[PDB]
Design an enzyme around this catalytic site. Structure first.
Site, PDB file in Angstrom:
ATOM      1  N   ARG A   1       0.777  -1.276   0.000  1.00  0.00           N
ATOM      2  CA  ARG A   1       0.000   0.000   0.000  1.00  0.00           C
ATOM      3  C   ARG A   1       0.778   1.278   0.000  1.00  0.00           C
ATOM      4  O   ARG A   1       0.273   2.309   0.499  1.00  0.00           O
ATOM      5  CB  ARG A   1      -0.962   0.065   1.229  1.00  0.00           C
ATOM      6  CG  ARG A   1      -1.882  -1.106   1.288  1.00  0.00           C
ATOM      7  CD  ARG A   1      -3.107  -0.677   2.111  1.00  0.00           C
ATOM      8  NE  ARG A   1      -3.488  -1.711   3.051  1.00  0.00           N
ATOM      9  CZ  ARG A   1      -4.551  -2.496   2.879  1.00  0.00           C
ATOM     10  NH1 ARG A   1      -5.307  -2.341   1.776  1.00  0.00           N
ATOM     11  NH2 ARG A   1      -4.848  -3.436   3.786  1.00  0.00           N
TER      12      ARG A   1
ATOM     13  N   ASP B   1      -7.043  -3.308  -7.318  1.00  0.00           N
ATOM     14  CA  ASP B   1      -7.588  -3.970  -6.130  1.00  0.00           C
ATOM     15  C   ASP B   1      -7.740  -5.440  -6.341  1.00  0.00           C
ATOM     16  O   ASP B   1      -8.095  -5.813  -7.438  1.00  0.00           O
ATOM     17  CB  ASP B   1      -8.928  -3.368  -5.746  1.00  0.00           C
ATOM     18  CG  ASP B   1      -9.367  -3.816  -4.361  1.00  0.00           C
ATOM     19  OD1 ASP B   1      -9.894  -4.950  -4.212  1.00  0.00           O
ATOM     20  OD2 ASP B   1      -9.128  -3.036  -3.410  1.00  0.00           O
TER      21      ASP B   1
ATOM     22  N   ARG C   1      -7.945  10.477  -5.516  1.00  0.00           N
ATOM     23  CA  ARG C   1      -9.094   9.575  -5.330  1.00  0.00           C
ATOM     24  C   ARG C   1     -10.397  10.357  -5.097  1.00  0.00           C
ATOM     25  O   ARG C   1     -11.465   9.897  -5.469  1.00  0.00           O
ATOM     26  CB  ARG C   1      -8.850   8.616  -4.162  1.00  0.00           C
ATOM     27  CG  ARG C   1      -8.087   7.364  -4.534  1.00  0.00           C
ATOM     28  CD  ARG C   1      -8.966   6.304  -5.118  1.00  0.00           C
ATOM     29  NE  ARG C   1      -9.928   5.859  -4.134  1.00  0.00           N
ATOM     30  CZ  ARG C   1     -11.226   6.156  -4.148  1.00  0.00           C
ATOM     31  NH1 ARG C   1     -11.737   6.887  -5.135  1.00  0.00           N
ATOM     32  NH2 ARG C   1     -12.020   5.712  -3.170  1.00  0.00           N
TER      33      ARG C   1
ATOM     34  N   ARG D   1      -4.067   5.914   1.492  1.00  0.00           N
ATOM     35  CA  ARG D   1      -4.638   7.136   2.085  1.00  0.00           C
ATOM     36  C   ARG D   1      -3.720   7.911   3.044  1.00  0.00           C
ATOM     37  O   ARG D   1      -4.020   9.074   3.379  1.00  0.00           O
ATOM     38  CB  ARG D   1      -5.952   6.757   2.807  1.00  0.00           C
ATOM     39  CG  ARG D   1      -7.037   6.243   1.849  1.00  0.00           C
ATOM     40  CD  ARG D   1      -8.409   6.776   2.303  1.00  0.00           C
ATOM     41  NE  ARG D   1      -8.931   6.117   3.498  1.00  0.00           N
ATOM     42  CZ  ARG D   1      -9.011   6.646   4.735  1.00  0.00           C
ATOM     43  NH1 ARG D   1      -8.588   7.900   5.009  1.00  0.00           N
ATOM     44  NH2 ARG D   1      -9.539   5.898   5.718  1.00  0.00           N
TER      45      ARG D   1
ATOM     46  N   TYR E   1     -13.693 -13.427   0.314  1.00  0.00           N
ATOM     47  CA  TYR E   1     -14.514 -12.255  -0.042  1.00  0.00           C
ATOM     48  C   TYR E   1     -15.809 -12.556  -0.728  1.00  0.00           C
ATOM     49  O   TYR E   1     -16.822 -11.911  -0.377  1.00  0.00           O
ATOM     50  CB  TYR E   1     -13.734 -11.305  -0.936  1.00  0.00           C
ATOM     51  CG  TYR E   1     -12.729 -10.573  -0.094  1.00  0.00           C
ATOM     52  CD1 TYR E   1     -11.397 -10.943  -0.112  1.00  0.00           C
ATOM     53  CD2 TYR E   1     -13.104  -9.473   0.681  1.00  0.00           C
ATOM     54  CE1 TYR E   1     -10.461 -10.296   0.638  1.00  0.00           C
ATOM     55  CE2 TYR E   1     -12.142  -8.781   1.448  1.00  0.00           C
ATOM     56  CZ  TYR E   1     -10.831  -9.227   1.403  1.00  0.00           C
ATOM     57  OH  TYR E   1      -9.837  -8.589   2.086  1.00  0.00           O
TER      58      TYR E   1
END
Lengths: 356, 356
Positions: B27, B76, B40, B31, B154
């Protein structure tokens, strides 16, 4: 108290030979039982915890269904941070929440003196004496609490967390306040656990559920020494009071990297999750300590015959000595009571057929 | 494509000697960077993923702040189940959700043929070619995807889960449908990863984030064989196309019990979490494979000087050969970009001072 009739669990815990492998399940009193939901439907969670008759009843329910070799008192690890002065909720089947978590060092000022905690937890000692009476010596009764680091994660995170980011942030950014909190927690736990034994508990389990979030170095600095202090002080206090010590279990969920130290931390029994192969666990722990565990509780979703085969394999790998069967984690609300019965029946029949 | 100028990361991955230890962060485009939040803020998450210029820009941002030894494409892991026909959301900073998760075997009928998946993921190949052009050979570009079992968690859970109870329930109660799904996932992944390399990716990482929920036996039956199949088929397809294979990394979060098998599964590099001591990891993996990791990312909450000391210790335990530095998990949104810079600066200065 009534003379204990089946002490197989205690004998295994101490490391002695037994005629079969004793078994119990974490959360054996839990929502997978309809009668547990029924009796809990009576009040809210923490008010259930405060009623000695209600905790006694929830503790006995699984024993009515299954010949488990131990009872564990119905309670919650979160009673200790509540008794320290934190406000807690079980918000509509969402789990534990602290609406006002500890977030900085100054927040420590709101906690009680840890020496007053045991007097706030009299209701649990009442539930324990009552249950030990009503059990009438059928099987031993286990008392428990959460380990210091695990309780600190709840108090700082405000509930469960997949990262423990805030709680580990305290360790990295506020190591001194962290040690202060861990020590408050240890100093509250020791007299609460001694009180549980004074009230009638025959074995103690310390639940270090959130250990695995730590690597080895954080765990060595911030969890292990408090874990060691708990067992040393409890045993010393019980001796000083003139009481027999009881066997102590340390359960460190996802704690593969700590097993060798945990075997040296003053506990009779090291409880394991399903992630460590039983043979490797034995290697890490030597052949002094007893091992407890470690069936994946999701295995109980399998058919009865598959459960039987998984139990046979698990037993074969642990071998018969210094072993107490259990799952690697608590039973889930959706689990089938008949499959729990199979797991219990399988441990008993296979360990005997393994001896005879 | 531009000739690669700094191939230290690739050299380490293949197992060759280097002048310093290369470093990147999971990552690194995330963020914790204000400019990442800024770019974003332009569209929603999956529409960001579909814009080649936007993924290219997010991939380059950390490289503008830090001399990282590799870029990883912005994307992703969930693009693959979306391309199989599942509907996904990033609901207001709550994480991934599938509003309609797979719950029974009949739900498999809604998935696309896995052989059509790569054509649904053309936008990622466009983003990769664009980024590899704009990088102009500064450092190698990594492509990635989620491993089969992790993607299955998921798709069945509908997002993240602390137990994976539903997903493991499929393994125990529907093992055949489980294998069918895992195979659909493998058969979609292999052509997507080959396409990433055709588009310009110089290394591939397979992310098995949810492995640790499995014990060894479930992991051996349901995750490892698909993990092995992915690397075998990707390498065979690239050879058949006339292309160089690239080095492949398997990252198995909480996968301590699988490390020995993962070292044999056909991957150049085994990526580790912070829970395995680097010296024990080396023991499990032998001295063929390269190791990547493994700093607790919460360590970056510590002061710069403390980060430097933690990096020094980590480097000393891994030793200089067959090692790529990285964290043990992705960077958190609240992390300080200056502390990321320190971690990168520390790996470089200590590994050199360790050589010179």
């Amino acid at each position: 108290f009534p003379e204990l009739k089946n002490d197989t669990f205690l004998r295994a815990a101490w490391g002695e030979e037994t005629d079969y492998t004793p078994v119990w399940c974490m959360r054996q009193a839990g929502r997978y039982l309809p009668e547990f939901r029924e009796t809990r439907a009576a009040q809210d969670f923490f008010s259930t915890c405060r009623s000695p008759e209600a905790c006694c009843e929830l503790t006995l329910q699984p024993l009515r269904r299954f010949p488990l070799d131990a009872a564990i008192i119905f309670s919650d690890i979160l009673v200790v941070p509540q008794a320290l002065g934190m406000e807690v909720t079980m918000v509509p089947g969402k789990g534990p929440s602290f609406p006002e978590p500890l977030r900085e060092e100054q927040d420590l000022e709101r906690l009680r003196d840890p020496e007053v905690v045991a007097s706030e937890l009299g209701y649990v000692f009442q539930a324990i004496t009552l249950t030990r009476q009503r059990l009438a010596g059928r099987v031993p009764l286990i008392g428990f609490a959460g380990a210091p680091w695990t309780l600190m994660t709840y108090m700082v995170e405000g509930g469960g967390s997949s990262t423990m980011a805030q709680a580990k942030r305290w360790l990295y950014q506020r190591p001194q306040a962290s040690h202060q909190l861990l020590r408050i927690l240890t100093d509250a736990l020791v007299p609460y656990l001694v009180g549980q034994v004074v009230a009638g508990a025959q074995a103690l389990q310390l639940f270090e559920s959130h250990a695995g979030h730590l690597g080895p170095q954080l765990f060595n600095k911030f969890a292990l020494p408090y874990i060691r202090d708990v067992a040393k002080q409890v045993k010393a206090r019980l001796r000083e009071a003139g009481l027999a010590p009881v066997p102590m279990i340390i359960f460190a969920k996802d704690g593969h990297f700590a097993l060798e130290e945990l075997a040296q931390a003053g506990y009779e029994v090291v409880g394991l999750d399903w992630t460590v192969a039983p043979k490797k666990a034995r290697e890490c722990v030597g052949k002094t300590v007893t091992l407890q565990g470690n069936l994946d509780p999701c295995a109980l979703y399998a058919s009865e015959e598959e459960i039987r085969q998984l139990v046979k394999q698990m037993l074969d790998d642990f071998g018969p000595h210094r072993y107490i069967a259990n799952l690697g984690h608590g039973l889930y609300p959706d689990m089938d009571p008949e499959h729990v019965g199979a797991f219990v029946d399988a441990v008993h029949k296979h360990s005997r057929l393994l001896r005879q």
